[PDB]
Write a protein that binds this ligand. Structure first.
Ligand code: MG
Lengths: 742, 486, 750
RNA sequence: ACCUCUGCUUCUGCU
RNA sequence: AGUAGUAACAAGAG
RNA sequence: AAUG
């Protein structure tokens, strides 16, 4: 037995009177102090100590015992270990050749149960080995710094709950007070006690590996494309800043990640195809050659029962029975009738802050489900009206009631926010506010149930009014009906009414619309699984910076034909099939006015022979959309051209921008940080050609800056001048020019 | 309360911001131009472009460095048996007799049949290493009662002018050779296409570094610092002969063993990290020290024989120098291969920025060219006051040589100089981008730069090259003032 | 006659895209030689020079000469002034509270709730600490343990109750103790007769007695900061001094820095405590926000700024007002707790150092003059610069060899509260209703200022008002290092923004070597470093594979383990070649045993034993993965998990690797320099502790993973655990009826 | 004591 | 000597 | 959408 040995050792330690006073005086907390007492020192330069110490005679220390005695004192002249004991371990000091003597002629130990301890590492190697690689492509990549999970887990738990799990698995007699985590995690504990059955690995290594495979490591990494953990563990070899590698790991991909990647794919396909001509054709064409990491898009659309709005449009375009099943966190809803509309509004929330939350016009009806509880819901804008929930478990009824309160955006839940809720990241990026409210009221809804507003219950023989404990009472919350009948929640899946038009609108068999292409979200997020387009011009399903850089590279490459058939051909150059992917990232309220302005600038350059080739490259891709003018038969005047996403995605008309810069000294164009040498494509005298001729629409250069016209004029002032008028304009910092309109 | 505290403060508390122009950019370091100051000597550890290795063909094996030097000297036995010193140049506080006795001791000890390269502690060895030169530690009362024991004035570095040999080292180390001194080990086989792209790009980026002279010098430094650290920790109270060797491979695969000299180690009981071990280095060369005698006042040069490389008669000189090092410089000499990475990445990133413009891989199309793309060329030199362009590989070799001279001539003067001139580089860049930069106190910037230019050769030649480059940037900016021409 | 110019690359490439060639980080970092007393005395002189126009007095606690620059007179020139006005600081903090309502109360409540559940063993986590009992620098868990074992001899027992608040209560109650007793070590000499010359054999043995100091001596030792030189600091020509505080200010600086961290996390302009890609995302969002807000036609500009004399020109008397302003709506006990660290920092006493060395060059003698005896020598026996410093130190020199340093925050320890003060300077945005608006970014002494105005002259007027405003809070902005250009490129904390943050591979170049933990950890650390630099710092595939080759070459030359089929010599290769001739699975050997390198880009994230487990010999994998190998030893969980790497710019960062505990997870021997000094008893004093702990983890096996909690003794818990083990042994047949009697008789003795 | 220890181990006081 | 650079090492201790 |  190993108990009487410890009692004999405790009787031994009481004779050392210093150890007796240390045992009697030091408390169990202060043990954490006296464990770290030594004569050592944290080395400020450890690489120098390793390089200096490896050249010495005996640089290592041995654990005192029977296993260090098996190493001999010398081996063929080489002195392995010495007799001088160590200060800390009180064992002998050996050379680094003693390690190789142990690996070559030492005793052979029982490594039974080894592949079950380090199973996270062998599963990592298995995901590498059973993987396949694809093409490598060169081109721009916009990486977004996102907080992602580094390694995949067996089960994601909070660190104190995972510590309770590890203490139940490894050291069960010291787990202390039992939590409720033992009953949830009983099969994981039984499995992990089966797997670590008869191993001789020390329990500190087992605890380190169990904490490695249960506790999450979430860090900020630059991510473009896939953010699931099986891709974040290969993010170093997945893509860089200027290349991408198609990769599919081993194992088996999930269903939530598959559905979220399907939603991201359908949103990108719709967001590209809306600005096209004949949008249904390009929607089906791109959707037929999309691969969600192993499998086509149609297989995910026919195998997964989710997908919000864009998935239904791509489903009905490919030909598929649509599934109108929304998922608000854990709230699985399916509509009956009613068509809301999203619009941003500055809600003044209960704790005293302003948030741009989206609210919905209309009146809607839902079949809702949470866990093993079901119900029917009916609402309007910021107004929970009716909720007939079936009877199920009490806390499942609680979760469903809280989720239906949060979903309806009812003002008794908006003003019922009294606590600490952070609607922003630590790095200052937008969190979704409704999911923040949902995660807040899933724990602390006592303010919600206090100030929600009570009423009386209907006292029919089938209905039961609810108190806060979900039992039978009458001081009930406003609008909750508990009938004992059945509801047949998700069995009434019958709508054979696809019938899409050109503009991607699911028109019913009656004749009305239920879905629209001006109904999908605008919040572009990164997919969990890698998503490929097996097509020429995959880059048209790219971000704003990638589309800008690819479009400007394509204009630069084909510059001679564009410029020659612009000087010779009149109105072919604008309506070009390579610029639809550039109008995919211009807002639809501004694109026609941008097109009229840029077309007037280029027409002004070609009519009177002043040509800046940087202005031609800059304002050529904005010309594709059909132009929209003002009411005076005049185009608009802009200082910058603002594109989708971010605040640094603008094209300055006069000076440089982040996305577009031009240097006339070195003749170097800079698109998104990449330098294209324009040396050899510009004309002869283009450094003495006037710059203010290609700045506004109908505004040439009449001469040098003169103070008899007053100060500089802004764009609203120049938009309201008479034709045949002089003005003063600052092009960039240092060049004021006197300018005649028309 | 801030408006009332700012209404009563003096108007003399201001930034006084001045708008920066090109005319405000005077040349840094005028005192390196005046000829009263002596030109800066050679103070590196080993010879770099004046080196000469005694080759000896081997069969792709390893052996003891004593037997390597013994065989390399057995081939050149004329230089080994020369026992008559022909003194050419002598350092001021040196001893030509003791350094020649130490050279004969190194030759007679590296070429016997015993396996031990220890050196006896004779009077010339004790002079060249320095024995009993440390001061005695006495108690503080015995010295407080004294009046002669004053605190010494610490030495400040000298002020030197531009020496013409640093440009010669920069020109010679960037040129290709026919030998490959790198010892790069293997990696795993390739599966992913990124690994194939990396291997194909490495077969371009590594050969250009590998054939140049600076990689041979780098490997000489690395191997000498490794063996010197091992012998400093191993045998502490012993003077040991450490041969300066390198292993080299020609264009046809035949290996050779270059022996560049011998080196004596002092008595290294190095406790602190800044404690010095004395190293007396004897190195072969073929450079006449009286062509450029302002470069070597630290070296004692003998003439020990002649060699026939193909058909011509090159003399062989021996450069003897007392020198020293510590554990920190030896550790950074072992980790001196990283001058590859800082030179490779900076060029490889450029190649990657080409590929995103073109869609395919552009390593061959930047090093050599193809049917569509022209080769890549960089402004890298100056001939008769005009520009000189070069290839991508020459720019890679130039950045590798710069990152090697950062190690070899690197002390606190180079740290302060780089950190204080980076702001001036960014100001010149802000003038080139037409951002219109403003300065608050420009003379403080120059005064903080110029206090680090004392006697480091790389710092003085970097100030010279900065003045030359700034003069080239000023005269090219005149097309920016000619825009809109009104 | 072509001459190569390496600056000419900047003709074709921009400088920000080539900035890695402007960092000489392959050279040696500058180390300080000798003493650091000159830099300490220079810090004291420069601190009292920038505040000499304030209120001078002599303290009626210690006796030292204190200077008060706060609410002193306004400056009249561009010298660095420490005369911070109190109303300006309070107006800045009130505007910061008005911009973020509820922030101060939330930060104070989170800091108070975090203080209420903090233990004393939080004070074992900061590398070196000034020990007042031996007056030296010690590890924190030995300084803390000596403080506790000396507090026990004075009826001060806030360490037994386990919380941090009773321990800090006993800390501030020891300042009222008239005498302090502690354990020190004297030496007793001993005669040994032999056959010898010049007498006998001298054996002076150091032994431990109780040394007692007075009240004011203890108060001066508690307020002391020990001073050293900053070694291996890149980017500077001349060296500087750093400080290290005692254990009796750590518990309060912990809470005040926690409170300032809770404020800094919720401010849009503090570039702290974020780091890595989180800092890059936050600053990119801030710049992209401030760039899409310039007026149409107006001019935005960016000041790349540095702060000169940041540590000498701040004040603990301003930080005291900040901890009184932030904790307005807190209970009074927390307001008394959060107002002790600026009190102990406003009365601090700088210990100078090792003194100066006087040498005789003719006689070749030298001696070390300590800091008490600095003025017990004529000043004509110093050099010019040291005599000039010793003339100016004299009105502040305490006679026991220390100096009074009342103004200035020496070396920091308030890096987030000074960030809060800089952010409060940044949030004012306008003075006098003029037509500009500023904002910016602020790390500890580093700012970047964005100004949107009409034209450039109004921008410079706003920058001038920002300079004059920062003079009122004690922020002296540097003019020899700050410059200002248009918005679109700047620099901040060695990050170079040029239309997006560019990569700077050179600053991470010194971390690419062998880290130096052991053979097992260094390979994992090296491959993790190459992987992280491929993700973060823009290293391509060819440079990553070159880094793998260079790392394996440096690894083999460091640890003396070349390939077995290579013909290198050495004491280790004689057995590596024997391993190469016995092994049939030669591709399953590790690199540390002469195996081949197997890593490439696709498998950098997998450990080496896991990559080669299905290629090993069963005898080799049995001997390498032995459960009871004598090389691993007693394991703690952070030693298995993490290792601390210091960057070239910033404090040390621990990184966590993945490795299998084999025979290559050895540990280096203990540095035996202590066997000749006077601290040999601390060897025995360690091995009296360790035995006790090595029995405790015998009885309580979860003590390595879980921190043991409890106010009872360490003997009571062990005796109860042994009694329950013996009872459940006899109630299962796993003991005898006689050995149970022996066990219970021994426990009846105990 | 041509003996022993040490190579990052800190020097307020025993001096 | 020399390394080096505002102060040290060129062995320290018993 | 998250998980501090
Ligand atoms: Mg800065």
């Amino acid at each position: 037995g190993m108990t009487l040995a410890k009692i004999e050792l405790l009787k031994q330690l009481l004779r050392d009177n210093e150890a007796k006073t240390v045992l009697k005086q030091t408390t169990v907390d202060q043990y954490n102090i006296i464990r770290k007492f030594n004569t050592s020192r944290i080395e400020k330069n450890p690489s120098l100590r390793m390089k200096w110490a490896m050249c010495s005679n005996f640089p290592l220390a041995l654990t005192k015992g029977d296993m260090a005695n098996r190493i001999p004192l010398e081996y063929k002249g080489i002195q392995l270990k010495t007799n001088a004991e160590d200060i800390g371990t009180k064992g002998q000091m050996c050379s680094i050749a003693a390690v190789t003597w142990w690996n070559t002629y030492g005793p052979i130990g029982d490594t039974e149960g080894f592949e079950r301890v380090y199973e996270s590492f062998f599963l990592r190697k298995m995901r590498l080995d059973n993987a396949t690689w694809g093409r490598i492509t060169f081109g721009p990549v916009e990486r977004v710094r996102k907080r992602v999970l580094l390694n995949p887990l067996t089960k994601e738990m909070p660190p104190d709950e995972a510590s309770n799990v590890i203490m139940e698995i490894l050291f069960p007699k010291e787990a202390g007070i039992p939590r409720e985590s033992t009953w949830i995690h009983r099969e994981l504990i039984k499995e992990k006690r089966e797997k670590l059955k008869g191993t001789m690995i020390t329990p500190i290594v087992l605890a380190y590996m169990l904490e490695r495979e249960l506790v999450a490591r979430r860090r900020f990494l630059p991510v473009a494309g896939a953010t699931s953990a099986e891709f974040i563990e290969m993010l170093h070899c997945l893509q860089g800043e200027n290349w991408r590698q198609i990769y599919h790991p081993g194992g088996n991909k999930l269903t939530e990640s598959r559905s979220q990647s399907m939603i991201v794919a359908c949103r990108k396909i719709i967001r590209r195809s809306i600005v096209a001509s004949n949008p249904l054709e390009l929607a089906v064409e791109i959707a037929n050659k999309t691969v969600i990491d192993t499998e086509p898009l149609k297989s995910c659309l026919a195998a997964i029962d989710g997908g919000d709005v864009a998935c239904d449009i791509i489903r009905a375009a490919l030909g598929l029975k649509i599934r109108q099943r929304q998922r608000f966190g854990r709230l699985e809803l399916k509509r009956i009738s009613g068509r809301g509309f999203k619009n941003d509004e500055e809600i003044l929330i209960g704790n005293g802050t302003i948030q741009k939350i989206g609210i919905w016009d209309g009146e809607e009806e839902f079949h809702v489900r949470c866990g093993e509880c079901r119900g029917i819901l009916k609402k309007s804008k910021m107004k929970l009206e009716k909720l007939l929930i079936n009877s199920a478990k009490k806390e499942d009824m609680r979760d469903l009631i809280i989720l239906c309160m949060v979903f309806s955006q009812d003002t008794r839940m908006f003003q019922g926010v009294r606590g600490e809720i952070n609607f922003l990241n630590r790095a200052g990026q937008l969190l979704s506010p409704m999911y923040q409210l949902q995660r807040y009221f899933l724990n602390r809804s006592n303010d919600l149930f206090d100030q929600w507003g009570y009423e009386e219950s209907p006292k029919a023989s089938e209905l039961h009014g609810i108190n806060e404990s979900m039992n039978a009472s009458d001081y009930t919350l406003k609008g909750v009906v508990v009938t004992r009948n059945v509801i047949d929640d998700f069995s009434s899946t019958e709508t054979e009414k696809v019938s899409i038009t050109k503009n991607l609108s699911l028109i019913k068999r009656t004749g009305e619309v239920i879905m629209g292409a001006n109904d999908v979200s605008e919040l572009e997020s990164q997919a969990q699984l890698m998503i490929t387009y097996d097509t020429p011009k995959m880059w048209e399903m790219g971000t704003t910076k990638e589309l800008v850089q690819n479009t400007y590279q394509w204009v630069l490459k084909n510059l001679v034909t564009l410029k020659a058939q612009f000087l010779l051909g009149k109105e072919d150059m604008f309506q070009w099939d390579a610029f639809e992917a550039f109008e995919s990232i211009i807002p639809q309220k501004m694109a026609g006015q941008y097109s009229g302005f840029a077309r007037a600038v280029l027409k002004q350059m070609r009519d009177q022979e002043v040509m800046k080739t940087d202005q031609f490259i800059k304002l050529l891709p904005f010309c594709f959309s059909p132009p929209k003018l003002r009411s005076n038969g005049e185009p608009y005047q802009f200082l910058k051209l603002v594109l989708k996403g971010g605040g640094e995605n603008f094209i300055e008309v006069r000076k440089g921008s982040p996305l577009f810069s031009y240097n006339p000294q070195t003749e170097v164009l800079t698109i998104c940080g990449r330098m294209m040498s324009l040396k050899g494509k510009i004309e002869d005298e283009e450094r003495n050609r006037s710059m203010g001729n290609a700045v506004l629409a109908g505004f040439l250069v009449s001469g040098k800056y003169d103070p008899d016209l007053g100060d500089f004029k802004t764009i609203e002032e120049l938009e309201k001048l008479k034709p045949g008028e002089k003005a003063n304009i600052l092009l960039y910092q240092g060049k004021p020019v006197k300018v005649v309109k028309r | 309360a801030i408006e009332r505290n700012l209404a009563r403060m003096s108007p003399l508390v201001s930034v006084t911001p001045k708008k920066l122009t090109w005319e405000d950019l005077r040349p840094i370091g005028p005192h390196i131009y005046n000829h009263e100051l002596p030109e800066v000597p050679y103070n590196a550890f080993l010879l770099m472009s004046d080196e000469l290795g005694l080759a000896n063909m081997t069969e792709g094996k390893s052996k003891k460095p004593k037997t390597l030097a013994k065989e390399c000297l057995e081939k050149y036995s004329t230089l080994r048996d020369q026992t008559d010193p022909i003194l050419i140049m002598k350092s001021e506080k040196a001893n030509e007799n003791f350094l020649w006795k130490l050279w004969r001791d190194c030759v007679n000890t590296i070429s016997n049949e015993e396996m031990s390269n220890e050196l006896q502690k004779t009077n010339y060895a004790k002079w060249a290493t320095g024995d009993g030169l440390t001061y005695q530690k006495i108690m503080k009362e015995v010295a407080i009662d004294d009046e002669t024991m004053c605190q010494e004035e610490p030495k400040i570095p000298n002020k030197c002018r531009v020496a013409a040999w640093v440009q010669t080292e920069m020109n010679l180390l960037s040129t290709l050779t026919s030998k490959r001194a790198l010892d790069l080990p293997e990696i795993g086989p390739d599966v992913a296409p990124v690994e194939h792209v990396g291997s194909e790009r490495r077969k371009y980026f590594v050969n250009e570094i590998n054939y140049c002279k600076a990689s041979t010098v780098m490997m000489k430094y690395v191997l000498f610092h490794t063996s010197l650290l091992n012998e400093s920790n191993a045998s502490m109270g012993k003077y040991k002969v450490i041969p300066i060797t390198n292993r080299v491979v020609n264009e046809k695969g035949e290996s050779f063993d270059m022996l560049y000299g011998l080196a004596v180690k002092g008595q290294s009981h190095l406790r602190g990290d800044t404690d010095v071990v004395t190293v007396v280095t004897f190195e072969f060369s073929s450079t006449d020290p009286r062509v450029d005698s302002g470069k070597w006042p630290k070296y004692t040069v003998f003439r020990i024989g002649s060699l026939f490389v193909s058909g011509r008669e090159k003399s062989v000189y021996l450069y003897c120098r007392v020198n020293g090092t510590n554990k920190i410089q030896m550790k950074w000499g072992m980790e001196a291969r990283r001058c590859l990475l800082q030179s490779m990445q900076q060029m490889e990133a450029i190649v990657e920025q080409e590929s995103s413009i073109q869609g395919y891989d552009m390593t061959k199309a930047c090093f050599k060219g193809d049917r569509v793309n022209s080769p890549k060329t960089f402004s890298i030199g100056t001939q008769e006051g005009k520009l000189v362009k070069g290839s991508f590989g020459k720019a890679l070799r130039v950045i590798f040589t710069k990152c090697l001279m950062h190690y070899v001539f690197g002390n606190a003067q180079l740290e302060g100089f780089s950190a204080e001139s980076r702001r001036l580089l960014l100001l010149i860049q802000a003038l080139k981008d037409r951002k219109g930069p403003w300065v608050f106190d420009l003379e403080g910037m120059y005064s903080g730069i110029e206090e680090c230019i004392s006697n480091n050769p790389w710092v003085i030649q970097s100030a010279y090259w900065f003045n030359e480059w700034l003069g080239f940037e000023k005269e090219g900016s005149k097309v920016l003032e000619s825009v809109d021409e009104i | 006659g072509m001459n190569i110019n390496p600056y000419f690359l900047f003709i074709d490439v921009p400088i920000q895209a080539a900035i890695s060639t402007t960092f000489p980080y392959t050279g040696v970092p500058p180390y300080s030689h000798g003493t650091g007393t000159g830099y300490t005395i220079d810090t004291v002189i420069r601190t009292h020079e920038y505040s000499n126009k304030g209120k001078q007095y002599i303290s009626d606690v210690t006796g030292c000469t204190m200077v008060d620059p706060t609410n002193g007179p306004l400056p009249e020139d561009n010298e660095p002034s420490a005369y911070a006005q109190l109303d300006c600081v309070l107006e800045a903090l009130d505007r910061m509270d008005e911009e973020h309502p509820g922030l101060f109360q939330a930060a104070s409540q989170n800091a108070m709730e975090t203080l209420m559940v903090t233990t004393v063993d939080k004070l074992t986590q900061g590398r070196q600490t000034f020990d007042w009992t031996v007056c030296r620098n010690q590890p924190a868990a030995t300084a803390l343990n000596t403080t506790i074992t000396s507090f026990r001899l004075n009826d001060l027992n806030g360490a037994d109750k386990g919380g941090l608040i009773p321990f800090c209560q006993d800390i501030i109650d020891s300042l009222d103790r008239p005498e302090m007793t502690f354990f020190s070590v004297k030496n007793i000499k001993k005669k040994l007769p032999a056959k010898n010359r010049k007498g006998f054999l001298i054996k002076r043995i150091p032994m431990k007695v109780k040394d007692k100091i007075t009240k004011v001596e203890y108060i001066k030792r508690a307020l002391s900061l020990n001073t050293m030189t900053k070694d291996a600091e890149r980017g500077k020509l001349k060296r500087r001094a750093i400080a290290t505080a005692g254990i009796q200010i750590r518990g309060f600086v912990l809470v005040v820095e926690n409170l300032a961290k809770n404020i800094c996390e919720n401010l849009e302009q503090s570039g702290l405590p974020v780091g890595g890609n989180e800092k890059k995302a936050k600053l990119s969002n801030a710049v992209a926000k401030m760039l899409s807000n310039c007026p149409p036609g107006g001019i935005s500009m960016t000041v790349t700024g540095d702060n000169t004399k940041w540590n000498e020109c701040l004040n603990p008397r301003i930080f005291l007002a900040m901890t009184e302003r932030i904790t307005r709506d807190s209970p009074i006990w927390f307001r008394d707790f959060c107002s002790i660290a600026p009190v102990l920092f406003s009365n601090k006493i700088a210990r100078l150092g090792k003194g100066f060395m006087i040498t005789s060059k003719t006689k070749r003698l030298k001696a070390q003059i300590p800091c008490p005896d600095l003025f017990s020598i004529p000043l004509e026996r110093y050099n010019e610069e040291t005599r000039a410093k010793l003339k100016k130190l004299k009105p502040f020199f305490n006679e026991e060899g220390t100096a009074s340093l009342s103004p200035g925050m020496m070396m920091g320890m308030f890096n987030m509260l000074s960030t809060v003060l800089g952010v409060a300077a940044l949030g004012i945005k306008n003075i006098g209703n003029k037509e500009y608006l500023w904002d910016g970014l602020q790390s500890s002494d580093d700012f970047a200022l964005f100004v949107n105005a009409k034209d450039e002259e109004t921008c410079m007027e706003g920058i001038n008002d920002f300079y004059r405003t920062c003079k009122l809070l004690g922020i002296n902005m540097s003019k020899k290092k700050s410059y200002c250009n248009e918005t679109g490129m700047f620099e901040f904390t060695s990050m170079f923004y040029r239309d997006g943050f560019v990569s700077n591979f050179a600053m991470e170049l010194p971390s690419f070597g062998v880290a130096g933990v052991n053979e097992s950890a260094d390979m994992a650390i090296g491959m993790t470093i190459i992987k992280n630099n491929m993700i973060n710092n823009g290293m391509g595939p060819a440079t990553a594979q070159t880094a793998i080759q260079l790392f394996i070459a440096d690894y083999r030359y460091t640890y003396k383990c070349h390939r077995g089929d290579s013909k290198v010599e050495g004491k280790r290769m004689k057995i590596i070649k024997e391993l190469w001739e016995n092994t049939k699975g030669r591709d399953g050997l590790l690199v540390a045993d002469g195996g081949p390198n197997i890593y490439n880009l696709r498998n950098l994230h997998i450990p080496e034993i896991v990559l080669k487990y299905n290629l090993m010999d069963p005898e080799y994998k049995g001997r390498l993965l032995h459960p009871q190998n004598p090389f691993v030893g007693h394991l703690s969980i952070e030693g298995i998990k993490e290792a601390d790497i210091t960057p070239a710019h910033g404090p040390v960062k621990k990184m966590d690797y993945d490795a299998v505990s084999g025979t290559h997870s050895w540990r280096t021997k203990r540095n035996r320099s202590i066997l000749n000094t006077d601290q040999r008893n601390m060897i025995l004093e360690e091995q009296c502790y360790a035995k006790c702990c090595n029995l405790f983890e015998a009885c309580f096996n979860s003590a390595s993973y879980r921190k043991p909690v409890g106010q009872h003794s360490m003997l009571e818990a062990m005796a109860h655990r042994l009694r329950m083990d013996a009872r459940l042994d006899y109630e299962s047949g796993r003991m005898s009826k006689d050995d149970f009697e022996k066990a219970m008789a021994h426990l009846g003795e105990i």
